[PDB]
Amino acid sequence: GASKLRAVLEKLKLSRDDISTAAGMVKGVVDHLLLRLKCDSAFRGVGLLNTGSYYEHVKISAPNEFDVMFKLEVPRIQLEEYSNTRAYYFVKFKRNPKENPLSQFLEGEILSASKMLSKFRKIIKEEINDDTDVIMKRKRGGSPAVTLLISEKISVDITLALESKSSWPASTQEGLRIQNWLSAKVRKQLRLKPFYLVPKHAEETWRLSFSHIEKEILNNHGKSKTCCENKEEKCCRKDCLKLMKYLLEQLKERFKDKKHLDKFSSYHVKTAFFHVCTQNPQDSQWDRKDLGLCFDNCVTYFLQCLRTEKLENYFIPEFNLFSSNLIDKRSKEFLTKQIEYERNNEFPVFD
Ligand SMILES: O=C(NCc1ccc2ncccc2c1)c1cc(Br)ccc1O
Ligand SMILES: [Zn+2]
């Protein structure tokens, strides 16, 4: 049935909702950094993505790991697609006052991410010590750009994002195919919202970031406008996504000593999930009574994605998250066997 799945969801819920001093420490540090950053010539317009977002948790199993985004608005941005990759871009400028705030990171016409991250980090690294023990790490880098450690238990990833309030880039034109589930008029409202760019390479390239659209969908996710508001209309969409996320996290934990699962992340799980939401648009296909079957649909579909090596980005249709140049055949084959073993054994990572 669903009894074991429900107990896992309850355990995860109680440790999320449990009273904790962690959010208070995170806010104190974040507000510290933002007052310092706003005084610099380059970052005077920096601010938190969401107010009330001192507590975004990418890892559903680790309530002490926090994800925060700092945004900077770039008016009249010029995007140049990098190397037909559809999702990666150079950032240039229209330069109305050619001494725009980010002029100091220009290299020719192209905005240097690594230079901008350099000053961002250095400014945070000096402000860190001038209350609590805050330590940072220069490891990996990219996005998350800056990782802080509050006390011993609590970690905070800080990602710097550029914000543009112009129309989404053309690679997204045929994406976000929610018309038969959330409706065409909601797709239009969503695509009027700004988009974000975060640093990453496949050089000085940036990629589109849609976490804010994901959050909007998840908070208003039914075909019915009253889905999950009360009574006879309680669905299991959010629970299926939580269980998918926890499955991958537990598997990456179990096999961290091997390297094969290193490239997989919640992006792959979230993307496959929203594809199943498109496949199954009716709220009656997500009945709370059917949690077991619905989670199994999600698992089946994800496994189908691994075997065919095809997982189309939910926002950029021509971008295959599972292309062999991104994740090789042997790694997808390894995750396939591990998930099939979980499924055929009433999921032992949920013990
Ligand atoms: O698809 C997304 N963003 C674009 C993108 C492009 C290439 C990538 N390559 C590797 C890793 C992550 C990648 C993300 C997205 C989807 C959801 Br649901 C929530 C937030 C998102 O940002
Ligand atoms: Zn619902």
mmCIF file of all heavy atoms in Angstrom, residues 13 33 53 73 81 87 148 255 270 282 309 327 344 350:
data_model
loop_
_atom_site.group_PDB
_atom_site.id
_atom_site.type_symbol
_atom_site.label_atom_id
_atom_site.label_comp_id
_atom_site.label_asym_id
_atom_site.label_seq_id
_atom_site.Cartn_x
_atom_site.Cartn_y
_atom_site.Cartn_z
ATOM 1 N N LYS A 13 8.373 15.420 7.537
ATOM 2 C CA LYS A 13 7.604 16.615 7.875
ATOM 3 C C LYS A 13 7.936 17.101 9.279
ATOM 4 O O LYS A 13 8.157 18.298 9.499
ATOM 5 C CB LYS A 13 6.102 16.336 7.749
ATOM 6 C CG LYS A 13 5.206 17.520 8.109
ATOM 7 C CD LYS A 13 3.717 17.184 8.083
ATOM 8 C CE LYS A 13 2.886 18.480 8.022
ATOM 9 N NZ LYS A 13 1.494 18.317 8.573
ATOM 10 N N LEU A 33 25.403 40.394 5.511
ATOM 11 C CA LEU A 33 26.050 40.461 4.207
ATOM 12 C C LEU A 33 25.363 41.473 3.298
ATOM 13 O O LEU A 33 26.035 42.251 2.608
ATOM 14 C CB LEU A 33 26.059 39.073 3.572
ATOM 15 C CG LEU A 33 26.704 37.979 4.430
ATOM 16 C CD1 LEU A 33 26.671 36.631 3.727
ATOM 17 C CD2 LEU A 33 28.122 38.344 4.800
ATOM 18 N N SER A 53 12.631 34.215 2.453
ATOM 19 C CA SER A 53 13.403 33.120 1.876
ATOM 20 C C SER A 53 14.782 32.995 2.522
ATOM 21 O O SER A 53 15.768 32.646 1.866
ATOM 22 C CB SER A 53 13.546 33.289 0.367
ATOM 23 O OG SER A 53 14.265 34.469 0.050
ATOM 24 N N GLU A 73 19.513 43.188 -10.457
ATOM 25 C CA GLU A 73 18.775 43.520 -11.670
ATOM 26 C C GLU A 73 19.720 44.043 -12.749
ATOM 27 O O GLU A 73 20.558 44.908 -12.483
ATOM 28 C CB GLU A 73 17.697 44.551 -11.358
ATOM 29 C CG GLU A 73 16.852 44.933 -12.553
ATOM 30 C CD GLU A 73 15.550 45.586 -12.150
ATOM 31 O OE1 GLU A 73 15.226 45.580 -10.938
ATOM 32 O OE2 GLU A 73 14.854 46.105 -13.048
ATOM 33 N N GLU A 81 23.585 33.469 -27.054
ATOM 34 C CA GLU A 81 23.609 32.035 -26.814
ATOM 35 C C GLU A 81 24.999 31.462 -27.071
ATOM 36 O O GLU A 81 25.630 31.769 -28.087
ATOM 37 C CB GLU A 81 22.591 31.333 -27.699
ATOM 38 C CG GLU A 81 22.584 29.833 -27.412
ATOM 39 C CD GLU A 81 21.658 29.081 -28.325
ATOM 40 O OE1 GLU A 81 20.931 29.734 -29.102
ATOM 41 O OE2 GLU A 81 21.659 27.834 -28.266
ATOM 42 N N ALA A 87 20.774 26.573 -23.383
ATOM 43 C CA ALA A 87 20.581 27.010 -22.002
ATOM 44 C C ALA A 87 21.688 27.906 -21.468
ATOM 45 O O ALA A 87 21.523 28.469 -20.380
ATOM 46 C CB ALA A 87 20.446 25.802 -21.065
ATOM 47 N N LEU A 148 28.714 29.083 3.325
ATOM 48 C CA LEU A 148 29.068 29.441 4.690
ATOM 49 C C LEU A 148 28.667 28.327 5.652
ATOM 50 O O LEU A 148 27.730 27.566 5.398
ATOM 51 C CB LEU A 148 28.394 30.756 5.102
ATOM 52 C CG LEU A 148 28.557 31.917 4.111
ATOM 53 C CD1 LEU A 148 27.711 33.132 4.497
ATOM 54 C CD2 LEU A 148 30.012 32.305 3.990
ATOM 55 N N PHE A 255 25.889 5.764 -2.004
ATOM 56 C CA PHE A 255 26.947 5.466 -2.960
ATOM 57 C C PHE A 255 27.902 6.639 -3.178
ATOM 58 O O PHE A 255 28.509 6.761 -4.242
ATOM 59 C CB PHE A 255 26.338 4.990 -4.282
ATOM 60 C CG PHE A 255 25.691 3.622 -4.185
ATOM 61 C CD1 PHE A 255 24.305 3.487 -4.191
ATOM 62 C CD2 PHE A 255 26.475 2.477 -4.060
ATOM 63 C CE1 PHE A 255 23.717 2.229 -4.089
ATOM 64 C CE2 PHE A 255 25.886 1.226 -3.959
ATOM 65 C CZ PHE A 255 24.493 1.115 -3.977
ATOM 66 N N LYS A 270 13.089 16.796 -10.209
ATOM 67 C CA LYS A 270 12.007 17.766 -10.375
ATOM 68 C C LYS A 270 11.524 17.790 -11.810
ATOM 69 O O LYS A 270 10.312 17.819 -12.062
ATOM 70 C CB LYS A 270 12.448 19.175 -9.979
ATOM 71 C CG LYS A 270 12.816 19.384 -8.545
ATOM 72 C CD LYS A 270 13.382 20.795 -8.422
ATOM 73 C CE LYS A 270 13.866 21.124 -7.016
ATOM 74 N NZ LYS A 270 14.571 22.430 -7.043
ATOM 75 N N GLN A 282 -5.111 15.600 -14.677
ATOM 76 C CA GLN A 282 -6.295 15.620 -13.829
ATOM 77 C C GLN A 282 -5.910 15.405 -12.368
ATOM 78 O O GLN A 282 -5.067 14.558 -12.053
ATOM 79 C CB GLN A 282 -7.280 14.529 -14.274
ATOM 80 C CG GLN A 282 -7.689 14.593 -15.749
ATOM 81 C CD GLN A 282 -8.476 15.850 -16.096
ATOM 82 O OE1 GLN A 282 -9.084 16.482 -15.222
ATOM 83 N NE2 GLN A 282 -8.470 16.220 -17.380
ATOM 84 N N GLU A 309 18.110 7.588 -22.092
ATOM 85 C CA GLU A 309 19.041 8.711 -21.992
ATOM 86 C C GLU A 309 18.402 9.988 -22.520
ATOM 87 O O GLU A 309 19.014 10.742 -23.281
ATOM 88 C CB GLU A 309 20.346 8.419 -22.724
ATOM 89 C CG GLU A 309 20.981 7.081 -22.352
ATOM 90 C CD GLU A 309 22.382 6.935 -22.910
ATOM 91 O OE1 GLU A 309 23.299 7.595 -22.367
ATOM 92 O OE2 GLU A 309 22.564 6.179 -23.892
ATOM 93 N N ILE A 327 25.964 13.326 -18.881
ATOM 94 C CA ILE A 327 26.098 12.194 -17.973
ATOM 95 C C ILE A 327 26.270 10.945 -18.824
ATOM 96 O O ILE A 327 25.426 10.661 -19.687
ATOM 97 C CB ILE A 327 24.869 12.065 -17.057
ATOM 98 C CG1 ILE A 327 24.517 13.435 -16.445
ATOM 99 C CG2 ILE A 327 25.104 10.984 -15.998
ATOM 100 C CD1 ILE A 327 23.120 13.517 -15.830
ATOM 101 N N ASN A 344 11.873 -3.013 -6.401
ATOM 102 C CA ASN A 344 11.599 -4.436 -6.244
ATOM 103 C C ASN A 344 11.787 -4.927 -4.819
ATOM 104 O O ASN A 344 11.657 -6.134 -4.582
ATOM 105 C CB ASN A 344 12.494 -5.262 -7.171
ATOM 106 C CG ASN A 344 12.188 -5.034 -8.634
ATOM 107 O OD1 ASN A 344 11.151 -4.468 -8.987
ATOM 108 N ND2 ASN A 344 13.087 -5.488 -9.498
ATOM 109 N N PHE A 350 14.152 3.900 2.605
ATOM 110 C CA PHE A 350 13.151 4.557 3.434
ATOM 111 C C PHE A 350 12.991 3.901 4.813
ATOM 112 O O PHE A 350 11.893 3.952 5.387
ATOM 113 C CB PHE A 350 11.811 4.570 2.697
ATOM 114 C CG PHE A 350 11.797 5.418 1.444
ATOM 115 C CD1 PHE A 350 10.726 5.344 0.559
ATOM 116 C CD2 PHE A 350 12.833 6.300 1.158
ATOM 117 C CE1 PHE A 350 10.690 6.130 -0.594
ATOM 118 C CE2 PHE A 350 12.804 7.092 0.003
ATOM 119 C CZ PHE A 350 11.729 7.010 -0.872
#
